[PDB]
Structure formats: structure tokens, C-alpha cells
Design a protein around this nucleic acid. Structure first.
Ligand SMILES: COC(=O)C[C@@](O)(CCC(C)(C)O)C(=O)O[C@@H]1C(OC)=C[C@]23CCCN2CCc2cc4c(cc2[C@H]13)OCO4
Ligand SMILES: [Mg+2]
Ligand SMILES: [Mg+2]
Ligand SMILES: [Mg+2]
Ligand SMILES: [Mg+2]
Ligand SMILES: [Mg+2]
Ligand SMILES: [Mg+2]
Ligand SMILES: [Mg+2]
Ligand SMILES: [Mg+2]
Ligand SMILES: [Mg+2]
Ligand SMILES: [Mg+2]
Ligand SMILES: [Mg+2]
Ligand SMILES: [Mg+2]
Ligand SMILES: [Mg+2]
Ligand SMILES: [Mg+2]
Ligand SMILES: [Mg+2]
Ligand SMILES: [Mg+2]
Ligand SMILES: [Mg+2]
Ligand SMILES: [Mg+2]
Ligand SMILES: [Mg+2]
Ligand SMILES: [Mg+2]
Ligand SMILES: [Mg+2]
Ligand SMILES: [Mg+2]
Ligand SMILES: [Mg+2]
Ligand SMILES: [Mg+2]
Ligand SMILES: [Mg+2]
Ligand SMILES: [Mg+2]
Ligand SMILES: [Mg+2]
Ligand SMILES: [Mg+2]
Ligand SMILES: [Mg+2]
Ligand SMILES: [Mg+2]
Ligand SMILES: [Mg+2]
Ligand SMILES: [Mg+2]
Ligand SMILES: [Mg+2]
Ligand SMILES: [Mg+2]
Ligand SMILES: [Mg+2]
Ligand SMILES: [Mg+2]
Ligand SMILES: [Mg+2]
Ligand SMILES: [Mg+2]
Ligand SMILES: [Mg+2]
Ligand SMILES: [Mg+2]
Lengths: 124, 210, 124, 52, 147
RNA sequence: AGCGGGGCCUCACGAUCCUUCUGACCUUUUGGGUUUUAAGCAGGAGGUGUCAGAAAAGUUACCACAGGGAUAACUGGCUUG
RNA sequence: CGGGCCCAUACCCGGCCGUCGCUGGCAGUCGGCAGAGCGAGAAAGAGAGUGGCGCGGACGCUACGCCGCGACGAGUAGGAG
RNA sequence: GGCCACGGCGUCCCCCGCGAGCGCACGGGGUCGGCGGCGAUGUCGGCUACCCACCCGACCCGUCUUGAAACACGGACCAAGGAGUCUAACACGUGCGCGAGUCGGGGGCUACGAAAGCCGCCGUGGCGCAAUGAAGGUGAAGGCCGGCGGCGCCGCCGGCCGAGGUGGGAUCCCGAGGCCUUCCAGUCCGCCGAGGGCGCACCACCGGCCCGUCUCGCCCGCCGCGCCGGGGAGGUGGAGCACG
RNA sequence: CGUGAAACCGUUAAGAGGUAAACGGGUGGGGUCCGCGCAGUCCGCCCGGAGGAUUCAACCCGGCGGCCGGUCCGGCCGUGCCGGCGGGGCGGAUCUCCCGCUCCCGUCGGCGGGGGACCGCCCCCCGGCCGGCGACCGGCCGCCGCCGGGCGCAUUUCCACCG
RNA sequence: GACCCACUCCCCGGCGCCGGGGGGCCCAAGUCCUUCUGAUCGAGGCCCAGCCCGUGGACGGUGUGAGGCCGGUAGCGGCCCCCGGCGCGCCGGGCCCGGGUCUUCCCGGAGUCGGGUUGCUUGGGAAUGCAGCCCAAAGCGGGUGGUAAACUCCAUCUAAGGC
């Protein structure tokens, strides 16, 4: 996400600011020269950024470099990446609700017969 | 009574479970006792390997683990008679033996024979009457150097053959792995019925031709 | 640093007295003897301390040097002053102001000096 | 920080010998009293004997 | 820490947080999850659809070891070897392609989910998928089968 | 042109489990193969009328227990056919 | 029907207590190496350069701290600090 | 006669940028630069605590209950004891460490210490990184450029672009002009700003890909040319993918 | 027979007593105690009056300290880098001289292991720049400050009283 | 059985000699000076050897509160008794003991297996295990190969005797 959003046109050689954690991604091959400020960067992501040839800052260094945040790109990770959000919303067993149910295990015998089949009574 | 969205559970606590509750407060004491008995046995068997007899190379049984080797029960009688050691002498000199193990291929048999030969070249034998040496017995130069080793005698470690880069040939480039797998599956599934149909077809053939 | 050390010791120190809805700090070089970042006598690079002389007359003015932060034995230089009140006050005031030695607390220092001199003066 | 000074090795007489060593980075590692207290609280419970 | 719990704030209040009208009785709805068809029926329908009934066939003596099959994707494929190998392969001019053993790594089937860097390879897998094989070929390379 | 996948419209009817019939060059029947059998998948039917669907006769003046002034018999209160 | 008069915890003015909001203000204690300011209808510099004697200045800021403006204050079952 | 936030010269066109002092106060919340008495064995002060009187108010608590002071029940008085605990599972919310990984809990090696430290070819394993189908099984982008064959489409090809779009989006970017001390020009820094943009997270919508199923269809492959294997277009079912 | 509470009881002292006692708000009256109250606060500057000192400023010597040398000399350190005809430890699913095993009539060819090359990291010896010494300084010079001792001898400075 | 190779290193009944367990008795230093108290184990001091010991500063007792008053505590500290094993030579006793190849022979557990039915039991489902009754075996046989049955191939053990 960091590379995509920094390689978007117009926002060249700016500083990307994250108030979260910057994490290494393994299915990426080429890392551009990036300029990063974050609360913490994982060890392998730090190694990748430095070996590519960028710089990593802390927030005090960011405040010294640009007190007003001028020339910065403010990003954040996917807030709805957590698995709990697949359980929220319209309750299951209700028409047009693709909400994951709470089941102890996934399998043939676990909550698949009565409300889910058309042959076993009804399908919502 | 269920309340709102939850996951309905099945606790197996309907028996008299509080009567049988095995606590682990004596775990550190058990560890100390095990380690003390281990040291006692090791010091009792003075020069012999502390981890007992040597054990052979073994492939794990099922498809899930059949790519890994490990240590088995004992060497097999075919391996002993190919290595040259006697059934009743192997245990005396410190080699694990079991008469249950079969040998379905030559590779495992040869690997275990080579392992036995290495161990036999490796051990040092003492004269059971020190004032009188014997034929196959070692000399004082190594009798002085004999010492126990920790851990397993000859550790069983799985290694991977080193495979170097190659230029890809056009036959390899043009092979269809997915198609080959699908046709293999279909042939294995249809073999018996195809043989049957050919049988009855030849039956009508001979009926018309006789 | 001073701010980090303060964040460690602000509520979990052994010089801290918390009773009668009042808070006090009993470290040696603390003028006003109050639990405060400004008046703390341990966490700063440069502090002063006004203490009565063991002789029972005059005051002793303690200054913390610049070099030996991690060397406690040779960190504080003591100046014994046994003069009259006005000139003792003038000497302390010059030592602080002219040197520009942590000028946040010259008035507190001379208040403590006046109090100690009054105390050394015999009671009626 | 990255500035690591040199610490002298003191003799049995209380006075400094000529030897001196660099400050290991562990002393420059961050201080986190909250999690030190957390770890201390959770590890001081492991030597308790049961009662009932 | 019982000093932080709700029981310390309920000292003095008569009902201990359970109301005067409907007291805290013992089991006013039934033990466990009974009543799933009669008086908890609509809870079971609204949050556990499909909980009752039978479906599918039965297998008497199952073996997860028999059915064991781990999978890997082309996205993670190049991470199974040292990136020194990738650098050397993209640097050399003879054209020799590195060999990958997903079986050695601990995978059996290769699924093709994303991009593959344009660099010839040879993949030694037990099973392949059609799109994974197609993407490997489009990169330019071979898929071999192992047992 | 259109109209028609029941009755001019407002009613006329029934889940899980089990049984029965219909359908496929359908899947499994387990170390491999052939063949009966059995189990699956989809759609109908056999019915719960206490109709969101336990399998169910009385008596106690010999009686018991938990409760109810949420509920009768006696008194008191509103009303006055 | 007319003037006057009496008083509730209601309304008005004032003091004090707490809660809420302004997600308000304060690191500017920048002092002889000095020059005191950011409250006032209407955006943005106490901007920089180039040519035409006497040695003096209160308190403060446990920033989880201190300070200022307004509004608000019933409560069983129950929740939270 | 009475009143006024009227008060100099200089021309060009119209009609006809800093005076000095003082002092008074209906002026960003009280001061006196005003006074008087009484105090040693009987007086002074002590809103609270002890006793008494008077005026006003005032029914006995807990509890079920629409309704309790009740002619509803429990209660003579005092002291001590006395009731949401622990284990396991789950769900969400918060704090911490690491992070596409994470976890030694079992084992092993080295008074407090039954603690602590260590093991990595002890990570076996659990959870996560892939879903779907009852199952056999299958298993997560395309387009363009130029030609040959059976307009277009398919393959041999070679090369290139290459991992969605629309709308709203906190912040960021550019900048028509402007922020004065006599007046002119232009230089550097900073700030404000018409208008215009690259758009995080998320939301809605439209496309796309994977598995099951249905309909319409023609092409491709060969060690076994077959009740073989693979592919497309359009609907629909899923606890999926769409830079963790 | 440690300490010895409450309920309840006796006695002493005080007060009170025809709407059971008891209670909230506001006063008044009387008690037992407290203030060890009963001639009323002080703290700085200045004027005046009486007194007494080692006694002020300046100057000299010595010690210590704080800030510097636009760009003083010398050091150390880097979650800094560049050089290297340098010397090494660790790792690599990056390559390739010998030894052991087995397959052959001292041999072609296979397997395991040791040897070397390369790459990446780190430590050390040398050189050159950047930054820091405010988590991390030594000498010299300059200014300022403080302290001790002299010299200063009283229209200075300071002590205690009075109006 | 034949043909080759190899070997005089096993065990015990008794005797004599070589160095963990149970018990007993023991092993440092203030009652120093002054001063509190009914009583000190309290308080102050004991220098330039900051009273003395410390491999002993655990605990208990003694007229409160003791490292040095007593028992103890530390020590691979000491001494004195009894028992076992690991070794030693001796006397005697049992036994004169092996392996490779070729050839000839030998080779197994029954009212049990298995089948039908009944009852209990199991996660075991056209019957997992056990038991009763009836039937009741074979020897290229017999059991098992988690869906009943026939045919046909493989795989894998050798039940109904024992430590
Ligand atoms: C020791 O013997 C008792 O206790 C008496 C007794 O048994 C007797 C009556 C009965 C056998 C029928 O119950 C009882 O139950 O009396 C009840 C009673 O307690 C005294 C109160 C009641 C209620 C309010 C006034 N009323 C008084 C009498 C009464 C008379 C009745 C009647 C009900 C009552 C009840 O219904 C027909 O005439
Ligand atoms: Mg509830
Ligand atoms: Mg309440
Ligand atoms: Mg509650
Ligand atoms: Mg109740
Ligand atoms: Mg309830
Ligand atoms: Mg409950
Ligand atoms: Mg139609
Ligand atoms: Mg009709
Ligand atoms: Mg049912
Ligand atoms: Mg079968
Ligand atoms: Mg079969
Ligand atoms: Mg009768
Ligand atoms: Mg009633
Ligand atoms: Mg009546
Ligand atoms: Mg008001
Ligand atoms: Mg109000
Ligand atoms: Mg309220
Ligand atoms: Mg009244
Ligand atoms: Mg009353
Ligand atoms: Mg009640
Ligand atoms: Mg009622
Ligand atoms: Mg009541
Ligand atoms: Mg009544
Ligand atoms: Mg009653
Ligand atoms: Mg009742
Ligand atoms: Mg009663
Ligand atoms: Mg109590
Ligand atoms: Mg959660
Ligand atoms: Mg007593
Ligand atoms: Mg009395
Ligand atoms: Mg009386
Ligand atoms: Mg004692
Ligand atoms: Mg003493
Ligand atoms: Mg003592
Ligand atoms: Mg003692
Ligand atoms: Mg003694
Ligand atoms: Mg002793
Ligand atoms: Mg049962
Ligand atoms: Mg047997
Ligand atoms: Mg047996």
C-alpha cells in the first residue's frame, strides 16, 4: 500500500506519515527510494527500506524536519482488515445477509442443513 | 439460555469431573527426578554411549510425513546379515535389532548397511579381562582416549540434494502438467470398466465370428 | 534525558511524601522541597542547592558541573559562604545570573538562603 | 542514543586502572517501566505454593 | 484482581445488579442450550441457520494424514529460496533457471494467485493448477511432476 | 393484436428426523477391479387441527410440598338489577 | 367587579460546589549575550538587506499541572466513572 | 435667535498618517491616606460536642406490589460470623511484544530456587496465510500492436502496456494576487489566498476473478482417439479474491 | 486471674418531666473543657538620634566554576559514509581440488564428506570527509563569577537599640 | 551330516584384601565502657584496622526487640561404631561349549475358530467388545484390510499356551 500510494502521480519525493506500524510485504520485488515516518517499522521492512536507499524517521525527527507537516503524505492501514468485521452487520439466517456465523468448526456436519438448504425446509 | 449473537458450545462437564482433576504441581520435581535418574544411569554405564544403542534410518509411514527420515526401533535381520554382524552379538556390542522390520527396497537396506559399517569402524572395544587382550580388541592408545558422547550416537539428519540451475529444453517448455494429471486421473478411474466393455465387445465379436 | 527521567520518577520515587492532600520531595538539591519537574534536584544537568553549613553559621551553595554526569563523586562543587545576609544574597544572585546557570530559580534560591540565615539567627 | 562513552575498570584499591571499556548498547536500550512492572507482576506469581 | 471487578461496586445495593421484579433465579430457561426448537427457536434461526438436520454422506474411518495437501501461491513462490538465487538468475546471461522444490519447502500443490516476476524458473511440485501452469509458461519455464 | 404457467379478488392448509416414488452413461461404497446392495444430490408424497409441529386415563373425604390475596368460599368497600 | 396585600425548591440578580462544552489558554521564566506585544469588526511580517554611571526585573508549569469563559444540576430497576 | 463629531493653504476633473503636558471622573466587580469602647479572679471568644426550652416541620424500617404508616409479612436488645466465588470455553473492548508470522505450554541443558536462564535440524504441533462442493474434485485480471490459417474470434507467435472505474472524501500539492512607515523599483525568507489537482481510511454503486449448479453452443490436445481430457457466452447459490 | 467493648444493671453529679418516647431546621439558656487569651500583629526601604566593629569599594596572589576561540591544538563516539595492492568470524536453496562408500576387467562413470571461489553481515589495522560531545571531553587562550589570604582603616560597609 | 575357519577370556559355593547408608560426641566471635528499665536483647561509643568473627548475619531459648550468652547455622570440617555394593587373589565346584557354505530332513495350541439368535456394552454405524444357547471347521489353511453379498487379485500377521 505504501509503494502504491507513493507512486500515485503528482506526489513525488514526499514523506509518507503513518501513526501505525509499517510492515514488510513478501510478494513485492522492487522497492523505490521511500521516505517514511512511523511509530515503529518491523525489522525486515526496515532492512528493505534501508537497502533500497530510503530514510526512516521518528516523529520527533519529523517535527524538527517539518513542524507544520508541509510536504507530507498521511496514510493509514485498512481499518476493516480485522476478522471481527465479517461477523458484524445483518444477522445470518436473514435474507441477503452474507455475515459469517459463529461456529466452533467448519465442516459438513456443522450448521449447514436446515436454514441453508432448500431441501431441508427453507433457505432464507 | 442463549442471548444475542454467540457461538453455542458443548462443554463436557456433565460427569463428576471434579473427582478426577490431575494437577501438575509435582512437574518440577518429576523433571529433577528424571534428570537425576538419567545421570545415575549414564554414570553407571561408564564408557558406553549415554543414549543407548545406535538406531537405523527410517522413513515415516504416511503420505503426510513420507518425505522425512527418523530413528526407528532396530536394525533388520537382512541388514545385519549383509553387514556381517551376528544377530546375538549385535546387541552385546550395542546395536538395536528387531526381527519385525521388512526391507521392501535396496536403497534403505544399503543406507543402513553403510551406517552399520560406519558405526563398526567407529566403536572401541575393551578387553573383558584387562590383563589379556584379544583379536578384535583395541589398543591402549585408544583405550586411554575412550569417552562418552552426549546425545544420539550417529544423529539422523535429512539432507537435500543440491540442484543447480539449468537451461530449459523445449520439451519441458511444452509439457502439459495439468492435462497429464487430469488424464491420469481419468484413466485410473475408467480402466476397469473399459476392460470390461472390451471383454463383452469381444464376446459379441466371437459370437458373430464363430 | 531529563524529561524521560521525570516520566520515570514522577510518581514512583523514594523521596516522595503524599499525605494530607500535599505532595513533597526530599531529594537534597530540591529548593522549595516540592515534587515538580522544574524544582527536581536529580534529573537535570544543572541544579543548585542551598543548605546550612555543618558549622551552624552561613550557607553552603552546591553547583552541578557540566562534564561528570555519570560520575556522582565529582559532580557537585560546594561553596561555603559565611558572610552577612545582604552580601550572601548578592553572591548567590551573581553566581546564578552572571553565569546564566539555570536561571529559572534564582529567586527560589535566595528565598531559601534568607530562610536559612533567619534560622541560624538565634531565637528571641 | 548512539553515543557510547568509555567506562574505566576500577582497581581493588578503589582507584582507576588504565583499562576502560565501551558502554554496551543495552544501557542505551529504551526504558519501559510500565512493561517492566507488568513482567514483574506476572513472573512473581510463579513461585507461589497452592493452598485450599 | 478482584479489586477491579463489578462486585465491589454492588456492595450496599440490595439486588446485586439483578433487579427486584424478576429476581436472579437459578435456571429460568433450561440447562445448557435446550429449547432450541421450542422457546429459543428464533434465536437459533436468527443466528445459527442450518443447525438442525442431516446433510451429505458419512465417512466411517477418516484419515487426515491421507487427505493432507498444503498449498502455495505464485505470490509466495519466490520467497521459498534465498533472494541471492533470484539476483543471480536475473543477473546471469546463459539463461539457466533456478530449481524450486515446494515439496522440500513443505507444500504439495501450486495455485496461481498473482503476478510472477518475469524470470525463467523450473517448479518441482506434486500437483499444479491450470492457471498456475499457464502463468509459469507465460513467464517462460517448465513445470515438472514429482512423487 | 394479444391472452394463458389454475379457479374474477379477498380463505380453503404443515418443519427437523424417518419411509416411498421420480432423475442422471451423476458421486461414494473405502488396498485394486466386476456385479447386486447400501448411502448421497434435486423434486413430489405419507403429518403433526394444542394447526412454528412432546408419544399419554382416572381418583384421593388418608393425603404431602413450594407458593398465591395475581384466584374463589366468611367479613369490610363501590353499585342497586 | 375594583385597588392592595401573603408565599413554592418556579422566574430575576448575586456567592459558592460539581458536571458538560469551548476536543479554549500557557514550554514566552526567549533579562545587560536584555529590550517586555499578540483582545481586536473586517486574510496575510515590531521581515531582512540592494540603488535612486549605577548590575537590577514577584508567583508560576506535581503539563496526569495550573488558569479562563458560558450552560447545566429530579430519580427506582439498571449502567459507568 | 439658536445650534454643530463645522475650522489651512496649493492646483488639477464635476455640477453649483507620530504636538507636549497636566487634572476630573455615573468609565474592564470596595475602599477609607476614618473612628469609638472593653478587658486578671471574673470576664472575653469557641458556627461543632453535653443537657434543657420554645416555634415550624415530622407515621417504622426492610420487602413483594399499580398501590404500604398499614387491620400484609420479617424485626425484644447487643456482640461475632454471614451470601455473584473458582475452573473451562466463547464473544467483543482495551494495554503490551512481535509481526505474514506468532507461540515452548511438553521435553531437554545449566536458602530465596517448585524461581530464573537457555535450546532452532527440539516448531512435532496449534492458530493464521484460500475458498468451495454431499462427494469424486476444482481452486482466485486482461488488453493492444502485425501477419498466416479455420470482419470478427482462436493458436503459432514476437514485443509492449501492464492488477479496475464512478461519486463523496480528513489531510497534502500548485498558485491570479497581496501582507505599508516618506516615495520608487527590484532581491531572499515567511505568511494569506481566487481558482485548479494527486487523493488515505471508509461508504454507496458499476464492472471483474475462484468454487457449486443451470441454459446455449462451437473449438483445442494426445503414449493410450475414448461413455477421454481442456476451454467459451450468459444467469444464479457461497461463511470467497480484488497488494495480507 | 492478659487486654476487658456492647446489650443490661447499681450509685454519684447535672438537667428535665400532664398530649409515649424519639427526630429535622432555627435560636436562646446552662454546663464540662479549650485558647495555657486579658493591653495586642507584624515584615522590608528611607530620615533622624544615640553606640560598637577589621569593615566596604578598588587593587595583588592562589584555587574552583560557567560560556566561549567566525576557523586554537588534541581526542572519543555514530541506529554516518567513502575509500582497501588489508586480516578474521558468521550465514547462503550462489559455484567448483581431494578423501570415504557402492556399482566395473590400476580404469570410464554415481553417491556422502572435507578443501577453495563468490556474495551478504559484523569485529579489528590504515586513510579521507559529515555530524555530535546538551545520554558522550582534555590542554592553552579570553571574558565573567565565586572562595581563601593580603593590602585597604573609615563621610565606606555591617551589627543591636531608640523615635 | 559333510567340507573349511576359529577358541581355550563363563558362572557359582566359601575364604582373605583394597577406598554410600544409619548412629553418637564435637569445632568463631562483646555479656567491652557509659547510660534507660521490674528486668535487658534497648540507645550512644569502641580512631589512622571505621570493637570482634564471618565458607558461620537461618532459626529457637534466655526477665522486652541478640551475628558475637546458650543450642545451633557454614565448611569436599574432625573423631568414634555397624551394614552393602563396586574390585582383589585364593580353595573347590558345574561346562568342555563356536561360526560360514552345501545337502538331506522337520515344522505347531479344537467344542477353539467361524456362523445364527438373544442380552449387555462401545464413537464403532446391515452388529466394537463380552457372555448364554444351537450349529460347528480347514490346512497353498486361518484372521484382518471400519457398508451387507458373490467373484477375482494383492497387502499383512500366525489366534485358541506362558514369563
Ligand atoms: C383456627 O381456625 C381458623 O383459623 C379458621 C379457619 O379455618 C376457618 C375457615 C375455613 C375452614 C373455611 O377456612 C379459616 O381459614 O379462617 C380464615 C381466617 O383465619 C382465621 C381468616 C378468614 C379470612 C378473613 C376472615 N376469615 C375468618 C374466618 C373464615 C370464615 C370463612 C372462610 C374463611 C375464613 C378465613 O370461608 C368460609 O367461612
Ligand atoms: Mg439477559
Ligand atoms: Mg440503584
Ligand atoms: Mg446487571
Ligand atoms: Mg427481591
Ligand atoms: Mg430473567
Ligand atoms: Mg445464572
Ligand atoms: Mg414465458
Ligand atoms: Mg371462470
Ligand atoms: Mg428431532
Ligand atoms: Mg468394503
Ligand atoms: Mg475386496
Ligand atoms: Mg370417606
Ligand atoms: Mg385481589
Ligand atoms: Mg358478609
Ligand atoms: Mg444565577
Ligand atoms: Mg436546575
Ligand atoms: Mg442527578
Ligand atoms: Mg405543628
Ligand atoms: Mg409525630
Ligand atoms: Mg414480602
Ligand atoms: Mg395486592
Ligand atoms: Mg413499607
Ligand atoms: Mg387498612
Ligand atoms: Mg396475617
Ligand atoms: Mg409472604
Ligand atoms: Mg414477629
Ligand atoms: Mg460483623
Ligand atoms: Mg476481539
Ligand atoms: Mg481481665
Ligand atoms: Mg451509669
Ligand atoms: Mg438528680
Ligand atoms: Mg529473642
Ligand atoms: Mg550495643
Ligand atoms: Mg548480641
Ligand atoms: Mg538471635
Ligand atoms: Mg557459640
Ligand atoms: Mg557453635
Ligand atoms: Mg450406552
Ligand atoms: Mg500364542
Ligand atoms: Mg501371546
Amino acid at each position: 500500500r505504501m509503494i502504491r500510494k507513493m507512486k500515485l502521480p503528482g506526489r513525488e519525493n514526499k514523506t509518507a506519515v503513518v501513526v501505525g506500524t509499517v510492515t514488510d510485504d513478501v510478494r513485492v520485488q522492487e522497492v523505490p527510494k521511500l521516505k517514511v515516518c512511523a511509530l515503529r517499522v518491523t525489522s525486515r521492512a526496515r532492512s528493505r527500506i534501508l537497502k533500497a536507499g530510503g530514510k526512516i524517521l521518528t516523529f520527533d525527527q519529523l517535527a524538527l524536519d517539518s513542524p507544520k507537516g508541509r510536504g507530507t503524505v498521511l496514510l493509514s492501514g485498512p481499518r476493516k482488515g480485522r476478522e471481527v468485521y465479517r461477523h458484524f452487520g445483518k444477522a445470518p439466517g436473514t435474507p441477503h445477509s452474507h455475515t459469517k456465523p459463529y461456529v466452533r468448526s467448519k465442516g459438513r456436519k456443522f450448521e449447514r442443513a436446515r436454514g441453508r438448504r432448500a431441501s431441508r425446509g427453507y433457505k432464507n | 439460555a442463549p442471548s444475542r449473537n454467540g457461538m453455542i458450545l458443548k462443554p463436557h462437564f456433565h460427569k463428576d469431573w471434579q473427582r478426577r482433576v490431575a494437577t501438575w504441581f509435582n512437574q518440577p520435581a518429576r523433571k529433577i527426578r528424571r534428570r537425576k535418574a538419567r545421570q545415575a544411569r549414564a554414570r553407571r554405564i561408564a564408557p558406553r554411549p549415554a543414549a543407548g544403542p545406535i538406531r537405523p534410518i527410517v522413513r515415516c509411514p504416511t503420505v503426510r510425513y513420507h518425505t522425512k527420515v527418523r530413528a526407528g526401533r532396530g536394525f533388520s535381520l537382512e541388514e545385519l546379515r549383509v553387514a556381517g554382524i551376528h544377530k546375538k552379538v549385535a546387541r552385546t556390542i550395542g546395536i538395536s535389532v528387531d526381527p519385525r522390520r521388512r526391507n521392501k527396497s535396496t536403497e534403505s537396506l544399503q543406507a543402513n548397511v553403510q551406517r552399520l559399517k560406519e558405526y563398526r569402524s567407529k566403536l572401541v572395544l575393551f578387553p573383558r579381562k584387562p590383563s589379556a587382550p584379544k583379536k578384535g580388541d583395541s589398543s591402549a592408545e585408544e583405550l586411554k582416549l575412550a569417552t562418552q558422547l552426549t546425545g544420539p550416537v550417529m544423529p539422523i539428519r535429512n539432507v537435500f540434494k543440491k540442484e543447480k540451475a539449468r537451461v530449459i529444453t523445449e520439451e519441458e517448455k511444452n509439457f502439459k502438467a495439468f492435462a497429464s494429471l487430469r488424464m491420469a486421473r481419468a484413466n485410473a478411474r475408467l480402466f476397469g470398466i473399459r476392460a470390461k466393455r472390451a471383454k463383452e465387445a469381444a464376446e459379441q465379436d466371437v459370437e458373430k465370428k464363430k | 534525558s531529563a524529561h524521560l527521567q521525570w516520566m520515570v520518577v514522577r510518581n514512583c520515587s523514594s523521596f516522595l511524601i503524599k499525605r494530607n492532600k500535599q505532595t513533597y520531595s526530599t531529594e537534597p538539591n530540591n529548593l522549595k522541597a516540592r515534587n515538580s519537574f522544574r524544582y527536581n534536584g536529580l534529573i537535570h544537568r544543572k541544579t543548585v542547592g542551598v543548605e546550612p553549613a555543618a558549622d551552624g553559621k552561613g550557607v553552603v551553595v552546591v553547583m552541578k558541573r557540566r562534564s561528570g554526569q555519570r560520575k556522582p563523586a565529582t559532580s557537585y562543587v560546594r561553596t561555603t559562604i559565611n558572610k552577612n545576609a545582604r552580601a550572601t544574597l548578592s553572591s548567590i544572585r551573581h553566581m546564578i545570573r552572571k553565569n546564566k546557570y539555570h536561571p529559572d530559580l534564582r529567586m527560589a534560591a535566595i528565598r531559601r538562603a534568607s530562610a536559612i540565615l533567619r534560622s541560624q539567627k538565634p531565637v528571641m | 542514543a548512539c553515543a557510547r562513552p568509555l567506562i574505566s575498570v576500577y582497581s581493588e584499591k578503589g582507584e582507576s586502572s588504565g583499562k576502560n571499556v565501551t558502554l554496551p548498547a543495552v544501557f542505551k536500550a529504551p526504558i519501559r517501566p510500565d512493561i517492566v512492572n507488568f513482567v514483574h507482576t506476572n513472573l512473581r506469581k510463579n513461585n507461589r505454593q497452592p493452598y485450599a | 484482581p478482584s479489586r477491579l471487578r463489578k462486585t465491589r461496586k454492588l456492595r450496599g445495593h440490595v439486588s446485586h445488579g439483578h433487579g427486584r421484579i424478576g429476581k436472579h433465579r437459578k435456571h429460568p430457561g433450561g440447562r445448557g442450550n435446550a429449547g432450541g426448537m421450542h422457546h429459543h427457536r428464533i434465536n437459533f434461526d436468527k443466528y445459527h441457520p442450518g443447525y438442525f438436520g442431516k446433510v451429505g454422506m458419512r465417512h466411517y474411518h477418516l484419515k487426515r494424514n491421507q487427505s493432507f495437501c498444503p498449498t502455495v501461491n505464485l505470490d509466495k513462490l519466490w520467497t521459498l529460496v534465498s533472494e541471492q538465487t533470484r539476483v543471480n538468475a536475473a543477473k546471469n546471461k546463459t539463461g539457466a533457471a533456478p530449481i524450486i522444490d515446494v515439496v522440500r519447502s513443505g507444500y504439495y500443490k501450486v495455485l496461481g494467485k498473482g503476478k510472477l516476476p518475469k524470470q525463467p524458473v523450473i517448479v518441482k511440485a506434486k500437483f499444479f493448477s491450470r492457471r498456475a501452469e499457464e502463468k509459469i509458461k507465460g513467464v517462460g519455464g517448465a513445470c515438472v511432476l514429482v512423487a
